[PDB]
């Protein structure tokens, strides 16, 4: 009586019907019921129910039945154990929190990593470079032209290319060389050609507009074409903000680097580590505030009485200056523009440096481990072939 032998994949597990009867509604519970001969596959010769499943984890499932706490067997990948407990009817939200973060690890990484006749050829200039030959050619050319645009920008901000002429009308200002403007015009011509080509075919235009890359491209090409458009009074304000917009022209490099792997992995890491980033920012804000206040008060202890101002010989004339020093000191950067100059200030400074090392090394390893797991997974999915589907599943 009350002695039932479960045969899982050729391994016999024996236990009392009561242990099965503990957790109701599950398949093993239904085994415990007297109406079990018809319900499940069973042979009267050996009085054992036979299940064609992995036994090595059914050990742990039956253990959960026995003691009452479900654990993750640390010798199997999380998804395998997940699929087994899914078969057995066990809810996967019962595992102990001590063994949940390692269980839900592979699956976590997996989820985090996740006219008309010539239209295919039109769109083939925006598809992946390796997906064709025209695609790779257009990609190389757009790369060259983005780099030329960026170099034109960086050299336009230079002094050697911005001499000031003795021109009065009586204001004299630096002017840019004509060659820079001409190269900029050429690059604008090329980008406008590419943008019109992409606009030709825009399926699901809502998601096309939601695409940040196209937004950045259009915003980057917007200021130049405003040369013809430029009331002169509003025009000066819009030119003033137009320089600041032209600042975005360096963001066109992400269009090129999007096809890199490490950058997609970095995007997934960032989007998947919001909590740790907020944690790091909170830690840094508390540290900066506290240590700025402490150093501002410490450096006044040795202040000379003669001076009318509270602090004359110290860089820490107020607290916000303390914020700047505290960041520079906690990140172990240490420019040396401002540093403590009193024994009390030096004590506070050493404390700030150590606390900075600690509260920077708290969340950063979490973020780094996330990136490491996602990068390893992406490199795996890259090295392995796409799909072959060698397994031919049996009919139900």
């Amino acid at each position: 009586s009350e002695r039932i032998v479960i045969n899982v994949g050729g391994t016999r597990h024996q236990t009392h019907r009561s242990t099965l009867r503990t957790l109701p509604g599950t398949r093993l519970a239904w085994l415990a019921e007297p109406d079990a001969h018809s319900h499940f596959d069973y042979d009267p010769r050996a009085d054992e129910f036979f299940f064609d499943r992995h036994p090595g984890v059914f050990a742990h499932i039956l253990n959960y039945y026995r003691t009452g706490k479900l654990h993750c067997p640390a010798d199997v990948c999380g998804p395998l154990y997940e699929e087994e407990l899914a078969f057995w009817g066990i809810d996967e939200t019962d595992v102990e929190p001590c063994c949940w973060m390692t269980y839900r690890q592979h699956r976590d990484a997996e989820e985090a990593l996740d006219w008309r006749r010539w239209q295919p050829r039109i769109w083939a200039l925006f598809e992946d470079p390796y997906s064709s030959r025209y695609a790779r050619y257009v990609a190389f050319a757009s790369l060259f032209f983005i780099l030329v645009s960026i170099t034109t920008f960086c050299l336009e901000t230079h002094e050697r290319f911005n001499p000031i002429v003795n021109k009065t009308e009586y204001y004299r200002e630096a002017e840019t060389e004509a060659f820079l403007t001409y190269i900029e015009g050429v690059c604008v011509v090329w980008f406008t050609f590419e943008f019109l080509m992409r606009v030709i075919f825009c399926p699901n235009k809502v998601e096309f507009i939601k695409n940040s890359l196209n937004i950045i491209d259009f915003v980057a090409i917007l200021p130049f074409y405003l040369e013809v458009g430029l009331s002169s009074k509003a025009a000066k304000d819009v030119l003033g903000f137009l320089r600041v917009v032209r600042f975005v022209r360096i963001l066109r490099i992400f269009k090129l680097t999007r096809h890199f792997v490490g950058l997609r992995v970095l995007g997934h890491t960032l989007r998947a580590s919001t909590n740790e980033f907020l944690l790091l920012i909170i830690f840094l804000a508390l540290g900066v505030l506290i240590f700025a206040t402490m150093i501002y008060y410490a450096e006044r202890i040795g202040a000379q009485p003669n001076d009318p101002s509270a602090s004359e010989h110290t860089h820490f004339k107020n607290i916000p200056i303390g914020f700047w020093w505290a960041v520079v000191t906690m990140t172990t950067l240490g420019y040396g523009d401002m540093y403590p100059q009193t024994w009390s200030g030096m004590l506070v400074g050493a404390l700030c440096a150590l606390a900075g090392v600690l509260t920077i090394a708290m969340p950063v390893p979490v973020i780094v481990n996330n990136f490491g797991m996602y990068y390893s997974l992406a490199m795996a999915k890259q090295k392995l072939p796409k799909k072959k589907k060698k397994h031919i599943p049996r009919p139900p």
Copy 2:
């Protein structure tokens, strides 16, 4: 004779009665006794004792019986093995020290992470914000007002808001703008209202006073109300310390940040890593002392004989200055306010930098791993539901 077969969860383990007889007092030992048929469940058909336990670890328990040294099977979470050896009667303080720190890991993290009718509504303003709607409103409002207080403080210490008027009576000093004092008064009104509301209901007033948060709040609200109270001779000394007390007014931010998770995890990490913090401080103190002495003596080797003082061209005029330089250099901060200027000094400086990297990277990874484990456990306990108790335990 002396050949006994133990059936654990449907897996047969065979061994001689002597091996069981080694460790006395334990349940398996009692099995070895001839009065075992009545004592334990047993069938004469197969001459095997049947125990309804996980077999995969009973392997290791019987191995401890065989050889004499108990180890932790590295394929099961620590608590599972703990519970099994608890059932078998084995003392859990016998495992080898080589396998103790990994065994007692999940359990370690677990332990480290651990009138009257309107009184519930009164206290609901101090309860968690998400626990109600009034609670969340009061929390947002107290957040806004704490931030306004802190900004008032930081701007009061500024120069632009502390001009010195040409007022004599004949001493001229900077005075704060009236708007700052008025905003401070408003914030004091709000905090005093909140403090009276919390004082209304104070169960277990001993633990309420032992609560550091309420202490900080009351100490922070103490200086302002002393405006009316302010002998003028004692009053000047108490105002002088009152500024230093007002320095704590920034500590009211912990009241807000207490509901964050990362901060509670950080508190548990700190309170659980006292030994490693003391170790780090000892390492740094030895390093600082030794390297300060070494650099002070090194920089005098090349000292010019003409100068009457021992050191005129070196920043290292004595040893404590060496302490400051040694900290700044060992933490790789390197302000550049003081640095070696002699070949001997440069050798000592390079040694200090390397030794600093090493003796800072010794204990810090221990602390960081503690924080990582506790944070993963807290995030697990957050993601999983609270409790369902699906398991229905069998009657004893």
Copy 3:
């Protein structure tokens, strides 16, 4: 019917013939075929096929048959599981990507770590030092002479050894002491003797010339012998580049350090971490470009209007200067030669420091783990004896 029992190494596995029939062409599939009695070893007494293999992993192989996804059992080294699935006929390119990077780990490290009578004695001066006594003597002597050459170089570039004489013909320049030239001549004599000795025996001269070490040695000995060779007009240009060539004379130290272990491990690590190095360089290039642009624009917000130039009080007069500052700040180096001096600049600076910590700590741990695995493997292969071949394989 359709119930087949596979006996692997004395452990019975039971499953239906359909599960075997899923994946065709494999050995277990052939078992499922009715012509299996003759094909494989089998006894009619127990109706079980017997395979003399490790059972602990055949569990996982049969599980792959059952569910359809192949995983790596995390309790066995990768090569053992590889060899088992090789025996069973399973393709090793089917394992899930979630468990591929840990599977292909030991094997990855393994692959990454991988006249005539007196000619043996001639070549024995270039063989390993420990491989003979003459070898060790010649190695010590060449070490002493390489070190003397390097010290001669470093002292020749010094000022104390380059006084300028009052010599006109009317140009006065610093000249090197005669002792330096004589020591250089002696070292050249020794290196030319060693080079002729090595040239005596040069098997597979194509690979001898492809050897970078011999290239470096010959290029290093080339400039001195050009003293006799030195048209005077071309001679001045070749001397000018000859100083730059003599710069390589410090590269002769790699000849000595090649016999060290850590350096060979470092070479394997570098050659095996090209992807992560390119990733790090891409991350740094994007960060440097973006933050240089941001700081250059930020520091102009507070620019004084009086000055004709856009920036007079800021170190960031253009963007490339921004590149230099951005590198120095992202690596937490922080010289202090140039730093932000405006509240906007300070915000951008703090962001640059944090982003630098993050995008430097992303790929560097990958590279460090590669080096750690390869170094542990090399130290293992060093500590273990070379080979004994105690196993005597059975005849097929």
Copy 4:
């Protein structure tokens, strides 16, 4: 025929006699011999040999017999597997190098962590403090006096305590205050009393003299007693070196800190990581040399032709100065005393910073992991009780 069933701890392993016959001389080989019934325990009823050993690893041992390569089962602590293969007769130097460094890990850490009536009371003042009450009192007192000595030293080197009097005979020099000399005398009296007490009982005087602590103590107490001893001509030279000896007086703090745990763990870590320290020093030496040469040559590219010296506007006037800069820059210290000032110099500087991060992060993690393992083991051995010997071994 040739089918033998080994029963290990109640688990049947089946294999052919040939597989056992492969590796000769081992116990399983002797099983394969026809004279096996008498040699080993065996029952003719089941034709199985019974061994009372852990089966879970005998799987791997028999696998070594089968394939020919021995691996470490990653689910058991190294010592358990070691003891099993020791029983089976397998040599423990056969495991593959891929699985040797993790196998020999716990054992590695274990090895690395390893008149007359009143003489016990005499020596009880040098024994551990907690080992008695007199011991703890003497320890606290010696701690106070060592700290007083160290503070006296550090203040004696100060300026405020070394005024120069207007004393001629006509040389004026700073003199130390009398209170410092008196406190030094008191501390010398106490240390000499303690040293005589320890000298009273010195068993195995060779090892007592080999003890570095007693050496340091005696050398530290040597200079003061030379006050009476101080030819005046030799006396000045010995006083000059006596100041340098007195420099060691700070080394008396190790006597106190020896009873700390982290310091003993650090000593074991250092003594056990000689190879990685030499590796780090080699890496740093190569990096420093190469980058110093590179920066010295880079900074001359933009050198102004007017100046007679090769370099006037650069800090890098020669190569050794380059060594100093290269260390300060590779350790990310970055004082800012010397930095590149030419675009070529800036490129070399960025390369130096990155290469420094890499070649410092190569061996340091190895050293840190060693310290982590040893510290965890020491904390384990501290938390667990000393010894109980509950296991009563069976007679052979």
